[PDB]
Amino acid sequence: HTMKIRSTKFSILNSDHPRIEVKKVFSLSPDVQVTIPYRRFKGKAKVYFQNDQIQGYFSCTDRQIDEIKISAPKNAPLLEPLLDICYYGSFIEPGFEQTFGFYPAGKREFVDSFFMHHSKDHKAFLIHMGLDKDLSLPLSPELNWKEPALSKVCRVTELD
Protein backbone atom coordinates (compact mmCIF):
# COMPACT_ATOMS: atom_id res chain seq x y z
CA HIS A 1 0.00 0.00 0.00
CA THR A 2 2.42 2.66 1.27
CA MET A 3 5.21 4.38 -0.72
CA LYS A 4 8.21 6.38 0.48
CA ILE A 5 10.14 9.27 -1.08
CA ARG A 6 13.27 10.04 0.90
CA SER A 7 12.01 10.18 4.53
CA THR A 8 8.39 11.01 3.66
CA LYS A 9 5.83 8.16 3.71
CA PHE A 10 2.70 8.40 1.48
CA SER A 11 -0.69 6.62 1.67
CA ILE A 12 -3.44 7.23 -0.87
CA LEU A 13 -6.71 7.83 0.99
CA ASN A 14 -8.77 7.94 -2.20
CA SER A 15 -8.19 8.45 -5.94
CA ASP A 16 -10.10 8.36 -9.24
CA HIS A 17 -7.56 6.02 -10.86
CA PRO A 18 -4.37 4.20 -10.07
CA ARG A 19 -1.20 6.19 -10.63
CA ILE A 20 0.08 6.20 -14.19
CA GLU A 21 3.58 6.18 -15.67
CA VAL A 22 4.63 8.75 -18.29
CA LYS A 23 7.61 7.68 -20.42
CA LYS A 24 9.17 11.06 -21.20
CA VAL A 25 11.65 11.15 -24.11
CA PHE A 26 14.37 13.79 -24.29
CA SER A 27 16.21 14.14 -27.64
CA LEU A 28 19.93 14.76 -27.52
CA SER A 29 20.19 14.65 -31.35
CA PRO A 30 18.14 13.22 -34.26
CA ASP A 31 19.21 9.65 -33.47
CA VAL A 32 20.00 9.81 -29.72
CA GLN A 33 17.37 10.03 -27.00
CA VAL A 34 16.99 9.40 -23.27
CA THR A 35 13.80 8.01 -21.78
CA ILE A 36 13.07 8.97 -18.17
CA PRO A 37 9.75 7.68 -16.84
CA TYR A 38 7.80 9.34 -14.04
CA ARG A 39 4.67 8.55 -12.06
CA ARG A 40 1.72 10.87 -11.52
CA PHE A 41 -2.03 11.05 -10.93
CA LYS A 42 -4.77 10.93 -13.55
CA GLY A 43 -7.75 12.86 -12.18
CA LYS A 44 -8.32 13.46 -8.46
CA ALA A 45 -6.50 12.08 -5.43
CA LYS A 46 -6.32 12.69 -1.68
CA VAL A 47 -3.04 11.47 -0.15
CA TYR A 48 -1.73 11.16 3.43
CA PHE A 49 1.91 12.00 4.16
CA GLN A 50 4.13 11.66 7.20
CA ASN A 51 7.70 12.70 7.94
CA ASP A 52 8.74 12.27 11.59
CA GLN A 53 6.58 14.84 13.48
CA ILE A 54 5.12 16.45 10.35
CA GLN A 55 1.98 15.00 8.80
CA GLY A 56 -1.07 15.89 6.81
CA TYR A 57 -2.74 15.30 3.49
CA PHE A 58 -2.86 16.94 0.08
CA SER A 59 -5.53 16.91 -2.61
CA CYS A 60 -4.64 17.17 -6.29
CA THR A 61 -6.11 17.09 -9.79
CA ASP A 62 -3.68 15.65 -12.35
CA ARG A 63 -0.37 17.58 -11.88
CA GLN A 64 -1.85 20.47 -9.82
CA ILE A 65 -1.91 20.58 -6.02
CA ASP A 66 -5.34 21.86 -4.92
CA GLU A 67 -4.81 22.00 -1.14
CA ILE A 68 -2.40 20.88 1.57
CA LYS A 69 -3.40 20.48 5.23
CA ILE A 70 -0.58 20.12 7.75
CA SER A 71 0.13 19.47 11.42
CA ALA A 72 3.68 20.37 12.45
CA PRO A 73 5.67 21.96 15.27
CA LYS A 74 5.65 25.76 15.39
CA ASN A 75 8.61 27.07 13.29
CA ALA A 76 9.24 23.67 11.66
CA PRO A 77 11.12 23.89 8.33
CA LEU A 78 8.82 22.14 5.85
CA LEU A 79 11.03 22.38 2.70
CA GLU A 80 12.06 18.68 2.77
CA PRO A 81 8.64 16.98 2.97
CA LEU A 82 7.12 19.60 0.67
CA LEU A 83 9.70 18.70 -2.03
CA ASP A 84 8.95 15.00 -1.42
CA ILE A 85 5.22 15.73 -2.05
CA CYS A 86 6.18 17.69 -5.17
CA TYR A 87 8.24 14.76 -6.45
CA TYR A 88 5.51 12.20 -5.70
CA GLY A 89 2.94 14.05 -7.85
CA SER A 90 5.35 15.44 -10.51
CA PHE A 91 3.93 18.80 -9.42
CA ILE A 92 6.89 21.13 -10.14
CA GLU A 93 9.53 21.56 -12.86
CA PRO A 94 12.29 21.00 -13.64
CA GLY A 95 12.56 17.26 -13.16
CA PHE A 96 9.73 15.71 -15.24
CA GLU A 97 8.99 17.36 -18.60
CA GLN A 98 11.87 19.91 -18.26
CA THR A 99 15.60 19.31 -17.79
CA PHE A 100 17.94 21.16 -15.43
CA GLY A 101 19.74 22.99 -18.30
CA PHE A 102 21.81 20.04 -19.53
CA TYR A 103 20.87 16.62 -20.91
CA PRO A 104 20.15 14.02 -18.23
CA ALA A 105 21.69 10.55 -18.45
CA GLY A 106 18.81 8.72 -16.75
CA LYS A 107 16.41 8.61 -13.79
CA ARG A 108 18.95 8.27 -10.94
CA GLU A 109 20.67 11.48 -12.03
CA PHE A 110 17.37 13.26 -12.69
CA VAL A 111 16.09 12.49 -9.15
CA ASP A 112 19.33 13.74 -7.53
CA SER A 113 19.14 16.90 -9.65
CA PHE A 114 15.52 17.52 -8.56
CA PHE A 115 16.36 17.49 -4.86
CA MET A 116 19.59 19.52 -5.23
CA HIS A 117 17.99 22.19 -7.42
CA HIS A 118 14.72 22.73 -5.58
CA SER A 119 16.36 22.60 -2.15
CA LYS A 120 18.73 25.41 -3.18
CA ASP A 121 15.83 27.42 -4.63
CA HIS A 122 12.19 26.39 -4.09
CA LYS A 123 10.51 29.20 -6.04
CA ALA A 124 8.82 26.71 -8.39
CA PHE A 125 6.67 25.54 -5.43
CA LEU A 126 5.66 29.13 -4.63
CA ILE A 127 4.72 29.71 -8.27
CA HIS A 128 2.75 26.40 -8.37
CA MET A 129 0.61 27.30 -5.35
CA GLY A 130 0.61 31.07 -5.60
CA LEU A 131 1.26 33.61 -2.83
CA ASP A 132 -1.49 35.19 -0.72
CA LYS A 133 -2.00 38.53 1.08
CA ASP A 134 -3.97 36.71 3.79
CA LEU A 135 -1.44 36.65 6.63
CA SER A 136 -3.66 34.37 8.76
CA LEU A 137 -2.40 31.48 6.57
CA PRO A 138 0.29 29.34 8.24
CA LEU A 139 3.05 28.73 5.64
CA SER A 140 5.67 31.42 5.03
CA PRO A 141 7.41 31.77 1.62
CA GLU A 142 10.56 30.23 3.17
CA LEU A 143 8.31 27.25 3.99
CA ASN A 144 8.59 27.55 7.75
CA TRP A 145 5.47 26.61 9.70
CA LYS A 146 3.73 29.57 11.38
CA GLU A 147 6.62 31.98 10.59
CA PRO A 148 5.53 35.60 10.13
CA ALA A 149 5.86 37.09 6.60
CA LEU A 150 4.34 39.68 4.22
CA SER A 151 2.80 36.90 2.12
CA LYS A 152 1.83 33.28 2.66
CA VAL A 153 1.58 30.17 0.48
CA CYS A 154 -1.92 29.82 -1.02
CA ARG A 155 -4.14 26.88 -0.06
CA VAL A 156 -1.88 25.47 2.65
CA THR A 157 -3.78 25.34 5.99
CA GLU A 158 -3.70 23.63 9.37
CA LEU A 159 -5.40 20.28 9.76
CA ASP A 160 -8.96 20.49 11.02
Numbering used by the authors: 326 to 485
Sentences copied from the publication:
The three largest gene segments of the Thogotoviruses, THOV, DHOV and JOSV are homologous to those of IAV and code for the heterotrimeric polymerase. In this paper we present the atomic structures of the putative PB2 cap binding and 627 domains of THOV and the putative PA N-terminal endonuclease domains of THOV and DHOV. Despite very low sequence homologies, all domains have similar folds to those of the corresponding IAV polymerase domains. However, the critical active site residues in the putative cap binding and endonuclease domains are not conserved in THOV and DHOV and, contrary to the case of IAV polymerase, neither domain shows the expected in vitro biochemical activity.
Sequence alignments were used to define a putative cap-binding domain in THOV PB2 subunit, even though the sequence identity of this region of PB2 compared to IAV PB2 is only about 8%. A construct comprising residues 323–486 could be expressed, crystallised in two different forms, and its structure determined at 1.8 Å resolution. Once again, the low sequence homology with the corresponding IAV domain necessitated de novo structure solution by selenium SAD, rather than by molecular replacement. Despite the low sequence identity the THOV domain is clearly structurally homologous to that of IAV as indicated by the close correspondence of secondary structure elements shown in the structure based alignment. Firstly, the so called ‘348-loop’ formed by the β3–β4 hairpin is longer in THOV and its extremity orientates away from the body of the domain towards the solvent, whereas in IAV the tip packs against bends the body of the molecule. Secondly, the prominent, solvent exposed ‘424-loop’ of the IAV cap-binding domain is absent due to truncation in THOV. Whereas in THOV, Tyr413 is similarly placed to Phe404, there is no equivalent of His 357 for the other side of the aromatic sandwich. Furthermore, there are no polar residues in THOV that could specifically hydrogen bond to the guanosine base, since Glu361 and Lys376 in IAV are non-conservatively replaced by respectively Ala370 and Cys385 (Tyr and Gly in DHOV). Finally, in all three crystallographically independent examples of the THOV domain, the equivalent position of the m7G itself is occupied by the side-chain of Arg344, with its guanidinium group stacking with the side-chain and making two hydrogen bonds to the main-chain carbonyl oxygen of Tyr413. The THOV domain is not retained by m7G Sepharose under conditions where IAV cap-binding domain is and, similarly, no binding of m7GTP could be detected by isothermal calorimetry experiments under conditions where IAV cap-binding domain shows clear binding with a Kd of 2.7 µM.
